[PDB]
Symmetry: C4
Subunit: 387 residues, 4 copies
């Protein structure tokens, strides 16, 4: 029976730790896939941690240039949330250097993008077997979320990008049912840039917080209705949640356009709470270190900078990285609303550290009705490795 | 359907071995999590061994200061009772440096405590997803049992401590149903000290034998009714079952107050048998070595020192450590009463041995109608390791 | 309930990647069985990757003469498609240095051939237990497909060869139901040579594309009806799809006889598409390197050389090897026709490279309605190994 | 529902290979438990390989004196038949240096014997939890089968020995239902010696072929009826099937008394076939090397030495060892009779080879209606190891 994700996202006051895999630390002696871009998605029975392997393991010579983002050895795999991305407990999902996945109440759907940069192919899987495909439509690194996709009443949706990673690119919403594509839409966002959207279900619609690697330090936002009509813009909040970025005091929000000159960026997330917003970000404003989430009153609908809550999950003396959102299935939380949860990726190795490799572990946090105390659940690995 | 643990604890004459994981010995070459504080808990289908990892493996550099008790890398995981705490067979439970867990007949509930010492957070899980939380209420290492919690007719109970580990601290009983907290009580025990309670179901109530790390060498006791009313005191028996402690001859029992001057201590257990009591303890009275369990006639209700039975499980030439209780589900034992079972933790490494690490394995014993012969099922590992 | 594989094979325009195990690369540090001859077969619930181990692991001395094709240590095992052939996730199937396997809708059937070269024995398994046997009938390396067998409405069929690997040999079709042999037929093919047939279901009959290691560079073909009547010949197409072979321009097809002088060969596959054919082959015409599949119009019924589609899966700068076919169960693809899928084996080590061992990994591709772009999903391992 | 093992044992003409684990060869680099005494037993759904670990792994220092037969680190574990006794796929069964196990149609029952030599304890398990116990009754190494026990219509039976391993000892039959002992009988066999019985179901009764380590070179036999009445004697056959032993020509059989002077011995098996018998034995008559099984006409009821069939499974240039019997459940073989199957243990290391350790792998064979060709599926490991 299809999973009903039609409920509203629960209003949360704080965040509690769900899991921590300790992938790298274990990888010093255990058999762990060198990885990157991990994310969480849950079925009505369990939550899994998806990740992009590099076809090699930690502390092995094949972990050499594992910073190259894309290769034909890159594969999407999964384990139960909390377990390291070890070989022996892993489930194979798809061949990919970019991916997304989600359960529709009956089975798992995954989308792995691989192939050559100018004509990549996204293979859609459902039930452990390819079922449909999307070919590059702009011919320039067809890619996707790097976080959980969203399924509402049997239908699943996700966003893909194809084109430059700086100047204007192209963006689409895809809709599928049982692994078969049944709809797509072109997102008009002239001047705006969308990458690695972090999405979740809310009041029957798909809400995402993405990344603008062109000119904005504030994150793009889009609300997707099942029919495929949408709303694109930026997190109104007058606090920039991307990295790199500038000071908050010198920032001016906008729900319509990108602000700041900073070009690059990093995947991030955000949850709407009525008119408010829970927004995650690295503590360092120039680097991928530390991690905190702030709740801004009216932050979702106005250029507000009023902070009602702040919780640290990784201090600034430790490397962070990607971070995305997902929700707990009602069939597991017992609650009457979708529990918002996010994960934070913690990168170790190049380009910041003295190693031939690059990989990451993660920490997962979830909704909760109380305010939780600050702390640092960092990676903890001691670099460099025996190599 | 909920597990009925309303029956009385079976009267046992001796104890038979259930399992032995050989974690450390295997860990010399296999991929085993460095651990500490292991315990057993059973569902209607199987018994599992829960443990606190240190986010690292044996014979790896990350096992360095693994004696520090608390860190943000510490996680609660589980395996089927008897298997070593190896990476590839482990299930992730919670992020924690202190924990408890138990099955209610439908699912597993676990409680992991992590965070900073002054404002720690206990995340409650049910079904593999966080469901509720308890924040530090005394702001000084919020902690729990380190042994199986207790579920009776759908409701599960457990004890937590928050405050100093020497002088007076504070103690509470928590009650939950389906992962949602629905009750709590403050335990008044002025002059007494409660830590790491070992609990089990008996005649419809929760009975625990705990640890007084303040001034007592005899163990605190509390009988918890489902409504949350309780009874707190000490094991009446005139034989001190804590470590360190003094001679038995020079000991005077008390069901009301702590006796002896010895400050420190070690987690231990005890089972009521009508008016009698099966009490476990290290053979050495000053160190954590050896292990034996004694049955004292009328030992539960009087300052009795009459020994009717004595069985050794670990001789005094071998290191022991923690030990807790749990019961076999009627749906597995086929019996008509709850079969009492305990486990003994065997510590290797610091602070007693020449290693950079600290970890432990275990041996599990269970009820049984006959007297079992003495022996030593010790750890067996050859220290030091390649390091 | 029996799996209905009575439908026609879907008409495909291109092929999308299903999986890539990265077995060798992982094997540099992980615990991977040295293997050879891998293949895919699917049940109504999942697809598995079967393989022939050599009773040893990569980067271990026992991988020494692992090029010898046959030994008493060789065993057939399986894992879910996409996982490396690692120890801890493997299911034991049969003792064998030659094999075939397939699911009939209720259980898995496997056929492992082992024993001495002059009187080998094929043990048939069904449900994880031997059920029947076939003894060598020609007394000269009794062998089979090295690819998925075919089950139609409860009955499974496969082809075996017994006799010389150069000059004329003998060939048979075997039929079984629930692991019990219930039929066999002798294939008269005087002048022709059949080895390692790659088969699949089509319009209610078993269609195979095999290997002629005697004198032909074009592949033998046989259409098997459930009653055991058959049709034997060669892929009509005027393009030689075996290796080694000569130029295409200098080739003349034939649906009746072997063409070319080239003796040796390599396992390959082919799918009928109405009158057309999708045929796989190594790019190099002299060596086992690179891999591409071509669609020849009318290629199945005429000596046609008209290429309508060409897709590369492994470039010529990388080693390839065996390749076979299998189909997706309707109960997984949701489609109304059998989705054609193939796999390509990529050999590393002897006799082409500087290693004491020989093994291989694989890449799996599947049907799909669109044309997919060229690329190379090669092995990726860095030889030689620590040895 | 209880497994019906009331049928007669199928008449077999030859034996086909079921599995081969390659435990030692894999153990050169993989994580394999050093073991000894392996055996096979099947449930209505699968066959498993039980084994006695030594609490340590191959190629690790803890494998040092692993020849000592008994220690408190010895544990009984299992895996699916065919898989090596690796850490990550193993199920914990019991603490033991001697064991037996079998499925009754509903669950697994195992019996592990551990403790001190003078007062050992046999813990009986059913469903993964201890359920009953047997204490040493002679106080001298209480021990059991080292092979599969036998369950007929819900009841399981097995044989235990307690006393000297040379001169007269004591022997009993145990009967249990759902893990609870409900019967036992003393076997009067004055002058005879019974050890490690290999048993199987036949025409509703339990038939075993055991080992006389006192004075006989021929094997003891006992037919056990469910009511516990029995028949004890020796394999009538005039061919000695124990090791060491003397020439066959100089042997005189007896169904009543032990023959030959040879003292020691080795576990072996035998299947009745009407009046005939399939008997296994090492090829060497003085050492534990090679393995063959012979069918002797009328061999079960007369001092017959008429050989109708002979099949080799391990040549004399390779080490063998223990060997026991088990039967395939009708619910798996689809047949109408119990399929007889045996396993052969192959010892490597001390006392015959230059290693600090001792362990073994195995090969499993099964019934079958045809005669199978001779061959050698030996261990294949290259000793010594890195140590
Ligand atoms: C070129 C476009 C980039 C996205 C903004 C790039 N995406 C892909 C598919 O390569 C990401 C980016 O280079 C890396 C990062 O910013 O950390 C990860 C990297 N993502 C992945 N390797 N999956
Ligand atoms: C500071 C309070 C102590 C309890 C009496 C302390 N508990 C915690 C949560 O740190 C324990 C104690 O220091 C150690 C021991 O006595 O062996 C284990 C240690 N327990 C854990 N690391 N889980
Ligand atoms: C001698 C006949 C050959 C088939 C044409 C030979 N088959 C067997 C059972 O040994 C194959 C051949 O030598 C190897 C190859 O061509 O790659 C694989 C090899 N196949 C296997 N080892 N399973
Ligand atoms: C002392 C009695 C012996 C049986 C005849 C002895 N049994 C036990 C429980 O120790 C066996 C014997 O010494 C060894 C062998 O013959 O190979 C195995 C050994 N068996 C086991 N270690 N389980």
């Amino acid at each position: 029976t299809y999973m009903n994700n039609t409920e509203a996202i629960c209003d949360a006051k704080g965040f509690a730790p769900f899991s921590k895999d300790n992938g790298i630390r274990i990888g010093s002696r255990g058999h762990i896939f060198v990885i990157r871009e991990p994310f969480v998605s849950c079925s009505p029975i369990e939550c899994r941690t998806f990740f992009l392997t590099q076809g090699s393991l930690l502390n092995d010579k094949h972990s050499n240039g594992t910073v190259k983002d894309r290769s034909p050895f890159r594969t999407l795999m999964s384990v139960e949330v909390g377990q390291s991305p070890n070989v022996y407990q892993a489930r194979f999902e798809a061949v990919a250097w970019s991916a997304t996945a989600c359960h529709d109440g009956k089975k798992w759907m995954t989308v792995g993008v691989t192939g050559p940069d100018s004509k990549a192919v996204a293979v859609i899987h459902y039930g452990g077997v390819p079922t449909d495909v999307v070919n590059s439509w702009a011919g320039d690194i067809l890619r996707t979320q790097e976080s959980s996709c969203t399924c509402i009443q049997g239908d699943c949706y996700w966003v893909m990008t194809d084109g430059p990673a700086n100047r204007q690119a192209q963006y689409r919403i895809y809709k599928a049912n049982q692994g078969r594509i049944i709809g797509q839409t072109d997102i008009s966002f002239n001047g705006g840039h969308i990458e690695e959207c972090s999405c979740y279900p809310n009041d029957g619609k798909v809400e995402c917080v993405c990344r603008d690697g062109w000119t904005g330090t504030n994150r793009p936002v889009l609300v997707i209705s099942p029919d495929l009509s949408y709303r694109v813009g930026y997190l109104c909040a007058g606090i920039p949640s991307d990295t790199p970025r500038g000071e908050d005091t010198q920032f001016t929000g906008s729900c319509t356009s990108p602000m700041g000159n900073q070009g690059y960026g990093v995947k991030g997330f955000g949850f709407r709470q009525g008119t408010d917003v829970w927004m995650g970000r690295t503590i360092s404003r120039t680097s991928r270190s530390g991690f905190e989430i702030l709740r801004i009153k009216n932050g979702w609908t106005q250029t507000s900078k009023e902070q009602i809550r702040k919780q640290v999950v990784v201090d600034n003396l430790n490397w962070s990285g990607y971070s995305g959102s997902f929700t707990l299935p009602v069939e597991l939380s017992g609650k009457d609303c979708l529990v918002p949860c996010f994960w934070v990726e913690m990168i170790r190795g190049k380009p910041e550290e003295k190693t031939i490799w690059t990989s990451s572990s993660s920490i997962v946090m979830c909704g909760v009705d109380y305010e939780v105390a600050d702390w640092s659940w960092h990676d903890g690995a001691i670099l460099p490795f025996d190599i």
